[PDB]
RNA sequence: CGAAGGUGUGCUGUGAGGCAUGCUGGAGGUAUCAGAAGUGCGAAUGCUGACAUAAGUAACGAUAAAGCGGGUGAAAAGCCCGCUCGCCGGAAGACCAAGGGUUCCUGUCCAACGUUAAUCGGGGCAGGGUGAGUCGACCCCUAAGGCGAGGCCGAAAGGCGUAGUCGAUGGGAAACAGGUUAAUAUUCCUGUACUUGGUGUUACUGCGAAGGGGGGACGGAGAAGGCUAUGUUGGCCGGGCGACGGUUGUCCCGGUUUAAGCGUGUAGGCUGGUUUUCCAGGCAAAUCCGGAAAAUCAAGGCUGAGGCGUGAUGACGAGGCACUACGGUGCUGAAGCAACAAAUGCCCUGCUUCCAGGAAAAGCCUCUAAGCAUCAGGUAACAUCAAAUCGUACCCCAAACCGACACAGGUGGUCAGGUAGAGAAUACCAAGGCGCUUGAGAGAACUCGGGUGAAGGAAUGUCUCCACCCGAGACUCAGUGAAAU
RNA sequence: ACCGGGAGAUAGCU
RNA sequence: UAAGGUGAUAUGAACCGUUAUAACCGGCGAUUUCCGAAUGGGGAAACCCAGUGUGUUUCGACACACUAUCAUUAACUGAAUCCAUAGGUUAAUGAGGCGAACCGGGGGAACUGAAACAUCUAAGUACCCCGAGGAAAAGAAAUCAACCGAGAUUCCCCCAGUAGCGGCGAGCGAACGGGGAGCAGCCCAGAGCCUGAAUCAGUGUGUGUGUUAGUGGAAGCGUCUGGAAAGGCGCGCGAUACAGGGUGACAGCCCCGUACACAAAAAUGCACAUGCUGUGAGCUCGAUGAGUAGGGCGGGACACGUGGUAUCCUGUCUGAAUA
């Protein structure tokens, strides 16, 4: 299984998540 | 004869979902991923050879890949084909 | 394990190729898809073994 | 889409030597989308 | 124990400049002498990035418009549900064409955005969803059209063009009723069946074409009727019984459905057929087509409305009821029928006439040429198998498609109701779709003062620990916050 | 008409 | 070479191996989906539709190879008339396209200068098409020169803005000659003599050289500042190696590197020897290039633009000699 996708560091105006 | 190896290769992986479970429990069908071509006769023969079960009819469909934006870069997932193999009154898995 | 099957005859190596294709490959892919597979290097090892067997078959048969 | 493909398809370009030159210039310029297609 | 760069100060020279130093800076700079510049900027309506002035002005995103009660949320006028009120209702309603690509729906949070806010969103993030013998594409044939083996022409190039080969915007094989997910359904199921074929059994025949004919086969208009979809009248069933008069009464409401196929095939028109003979031509062959003669009878077939039943003791169905984990499932099933009118829908590519005479080929059809003529070959009935592949989500007269902005404009056809009204004209309405954007300084995070504020008093709230309100500091209504200049 | 080249055409003119 | 790795964004889970088949680089091989000259046919690129021959789990349906054109060659068929020809079928050889510039050939402008503009220039330039080449073309006089002299072609500098051409305007602009890089000569048109006779083309072996992986390869410590020193101070060393990069501040002596010395199982281009197939020495004589030169008509290159205009070619009409 591959849950981890390694989300990258986003932009200063990025989705708050 | 490479018929057996082609039949082994055509099947890639099963598909698990609420709709798949409902179909299995009600209509007695198994939905599973198949090769890009995965012609009906070949997939039926592969199912018969591997699962040693009996089937009524097999119908397949093409699922277009989704376009997702990772970071600032877009990308479309590879297209995959899924087939619904309908088992007869006698099924094992 | 590269020269073990090099001296084998065509029929027996073809049978070994069929065994590798049927067992240890379909079961491994099904387990990986279902999420029950804990070790993934088996897929790579079996794929490399199948490729080696195919290469040996091509080298022997014909030319 | 049918008219676009028939009027600007690579086959239509090759049908005349001019389209072959256009394709060669496109390849030299290294444009990712050589022609219009699905 | 501090280079260049940047920020200030004091001196120095007629000047372009030079020296020393505090501060941030952080590892390069470079004395004097000689040489080249992409060698010095204040303008060329100069070019690129950024920012003030007007400009916190212009409208508020389509004149149907929303009000309230509750659920969530920290907060709700626009989020969710419900009750009211207003609109389109021949479109703003329902489908597909094209055009887009997952915008469809489940969960998740408002990173960023939505002409305010939005907890919602077609937003942002993960997971599902598109199932094709009967749908469409696909494929057989095709003209508009092209392309073009040989070749003709043509400085090269290239153009023309036969055999042919491509294609539809056309003609060809076939499906519907019901049920069915948050998202698919005619491809998911429950049945009815209908078509495509080859092979295997049965019976033998006369089979057999880049050949013959029909057929395909095609214009406008007019009476239209026999009907049907559709509606209304009755009609039975179920309820019911009436908060402001009467309303157990011809009182009120809701339903009273028809499949695809199987036949039955009727009104219809069409032209006459039944038979005997001969024979021109269609090249060729034909017995096929037809032409002419003759006796006979008027029958002949054509598809065809509708119709009946079969399908079908069809599913569905008034409904209320058992739970209602309160979204729905389940009990099932009463009536499920007659008459009228009536379609611009069928018969109908009909009929009739009108005129200039209204594509093409293939499919489909009998004889059949050669050839095969015990056979092969085909039909008839049975057997089996399979019907390749592709799209099937979603918007589709629209927020997702074409429109420079969720741009006011459009976007092919298709179904497109009831009442009054002749009028797919209007006005209002059923279902369906809607209400298509407003009003914010919050006093928020926080800061301070106070009317004051549970108690002890030294811990009058200044504190154990208090909060409502008011005065102020705190984007203001928020948005196109452009414009020439 | 548009696109690339002659072409940084020429311009007694701003 | 080898004790680190499963290429990176980009960590993680699970694994190989550490003295050798962990991993990496290289040479030789295999596979190499579809479109792409596309080549079995079609078409809207990654798509659709077939025939033929090879062998097969339910006839079911499969896997492999072939199925375009031209030119030539070989074979078999093959009308208008006997023969014949054309055409038709099978097999073999080579190409069909792409690629930045360079060569030749066939075309070929306009803007612009002359202060305008038609001759001219711009210019045989931009651009278009065809050919193979690694260079291409051309190349061994029917040349100059002047009656003194050289014997291939190409390129560079003078000759040389000279002579010349030119609405004698703008502009174009050589040739002879001298110095340099490099110098290689021959073949057929025809008979006889001796006949592998040197030089070459196509293939194996051996020697030397270079690449495709690479190996070894010297030398500084303590103290002060200071985040850490390669910086300051002290005394030492390598150097056929202070040319460069990294290393918490500027490193010869920290590492990778550099000078230098080596390395190749396998394929390689280059220079030779040794093996095989093919054309092919010299001697005697003759032959020695015909629709060509030249001329008439209109033009292009030679600086030469038709002027008194030399030379070649060009489409057309004519057109001899050959020592």
From Swiss-Prot, chain A:
The disulfide bridges present are none
Query: What is the protein named?
Result: Apidaecin-1B
Lineage, uppermost ranks:
Eukaryota, Metazoa, Ecdysozoa, Arthropoda, Hexapoda
What stretch of the parent protein is included here? 44 to 60 of 144
Swiss-Prot record, chain B:
Query: What InterPro entries has UniProt attached to this entry?
Result: Nucleotide-bd_a/b_plait_sf, Ribosomal_uL23-like, Ribosomal_uL23/eL15/eS24_sf, Ribosomal_uL23_CS
Kindly name one Pfam family recorded for this protein. Ribosomal_L23
Q: What is the effect of changing residue 18 to A?
A: Binds normally to ribosomes; strongly reduces trigger factor binding
Output the GO biological process annotations, alphabetical, semicolon-separated. cytoplasmic translation; ribosomal large subunit assembly
Q: Which domain of life is it from?
A: Bacteria
Listed result of changing residue 52 to K: No effect on trigger factor binding
Keyword terms of this UniProt record: Ribonucleoprotein, Ribosomal protein, RNA-binding, rRNA-binding
The keyword Ribonucleoprotein appears for this protein: yes
Q: Name one GO molecular function term.
A: structural constituent of ribosome
Gene Ontology cellular-component annotations? cytoplasm; cytosolic large ribosomal subunit
* Record function comment: One of the early assembly proteins, it binds 23S rRNA; is essential for growth. One of the proteins that surround the polypeptide exit tunnel on the outside of the subunit. Acts as the docking site for trigger factor for Ffh binding to the ribosome (SRP54) and to nascent polypeptide chains.
Question: What NCBIfam families does the record point to?
Answer: PRK05738.1-1, PRK05738.1-3, PRK05738.2-4
Subunit-level organization: Part of the 50S ribosomal subunit. Contacts protein L29 and trigger factor. Might also contact SecE and probably does contact SecG and SecY when the SecYEG translocation complex is docked with the ribosome.
HAMAP family linked to this entry: Ribosomal_uL23_B (MF_01369_B)
* Family that this chain belongs to: Belongs to the universal ribosomal protein uL23 family.
Q: What is this protein called?
A: Large ribosomal subunit protein uL23
UniProtKB/Swiss-Prot annotation, chain C:
Q: What happens when the gene is disrupted?
A: Cells missing both S17 and L29 grow very slowly and have a rather unstable temperature-sensitive phenotype.
Q: Which GO terms describe its biological process?
A: cytoplasmic translation; ribosomal large subunit assembly
A Pfam family it matches: Ribosomal_L29
The alphabetical list of record keywords is: Ribonucleoprotein, Ribosomal protein, RNA-binding, rRNA-binding
Origin superkingdom: Bacteria
Question: Which PROSITE patterns does UniProt cross-reference here?
Answer: RIBOSOMAL_L29 (PS00579)
Q: Name one GO cellular component term.
A: cytoplasm
UniProt-listed InterPro entries:
Ribosomal_protein_uL29 (IPR050063), Ribosomal_uL29 (IPR001854), Ribosomal_uL29_CS (IPR018254), Ribosomal_uL29_sf (IPR036049)
Q: Quote the CDD domains the UniProt record gives.
A: Ribosomal_L29_HIP
Q: Which GO terms describe its molecular function?
A: rRNA binding; structural constituent of ribosome
Q: How does it assemble?
A: Part of the 50s ribosomal subunit. Contacts protein L23, trigger factor and protein nascent chains. Might also contact SecE and probably does contact SecG when the SecYEG translocation complex is docked with the ribosome.
User: Into which family does the record put it?
Assistant: Belongs to the universal ribosomal protein uL29 family.
The record's function comment reads:
Binds 23S rRNA. It is not essential for growth.
What is the recorded name of this protein?
Large ribosomal subunit protein uL29
Provide the species name: Escherichia coli (strain K12)
From Swiss-Prot, chain D:
Keyword Electron transport carried by entry: no
Q: Which GO terms describe its biological process?
A: cytoplasmic translation
Molecular function, one GO term: structural constituent of ribosome
Shown part of the complete sequence? 9 to 46 of 46
Protein name stated in the entry: Large ribosomal subunit protein bL34
Which Gene Ontology cellular component annotation is one that this UniProt entry carries? cytosolic large ribosomal subunit
Assembly behavior: Part of the 50S ribosomal subunit.
Question: Per UniProt, which keywords does this protein have?
Answer: Ribonucleoprotein, Ribosomal protein
Record family assignment? Belongs to the bacterial ribosomal protein bL34 family.
- Is Ribosomal protein one of the keywords UniProt gives this record? yes
């Amino acid at each position: 299984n591959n849950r981890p996708v390694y989300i990258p560091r986003p932009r200063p105006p990025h989705p708050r998540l | 004869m490479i018929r057996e190896e082609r039949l082994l290769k055509v099947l890639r992986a099963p598909h698990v979902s609420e709709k798949a479970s409902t179909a299995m429990e009600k209509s007695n069908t198994i939905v599973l991923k198949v090769a890009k071509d995965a012609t009906k006769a070949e997939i039926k023969a592969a199912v018969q050879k591997l699962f040693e079960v009996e089937v009524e009819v097999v119908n397949t469909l093409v699922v277009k890949g989704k376009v997702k934006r990772h970071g600032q870069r877009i990308g479309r997932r590879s297209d995959w084909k899924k087939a619904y193999v309908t088992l007869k009154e006698g099924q094992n898995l | 394990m590269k020269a073990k099957e090099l001296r084998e005859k065509s029929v027996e190596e073809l049978n070994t190729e069929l065994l590798n294709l049927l067992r240890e490959q379909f079961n491994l892919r099904m387990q990986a898809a279902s999420g029950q597979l804990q070790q993934s290097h088996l897929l790579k090892q079996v794929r490399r073994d199948v490729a080696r067997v195919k290469t040996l078959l091509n080298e022997k048969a014909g030319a | 889409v049918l008219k676009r493909n028939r009027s600007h398809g690579f086959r239509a370009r090759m049908a005349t030597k001019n389209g072959r030159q256009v394709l060669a210039r496109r390849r030299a310029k290294g444009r990712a989308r050589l022609t219009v297609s699905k």
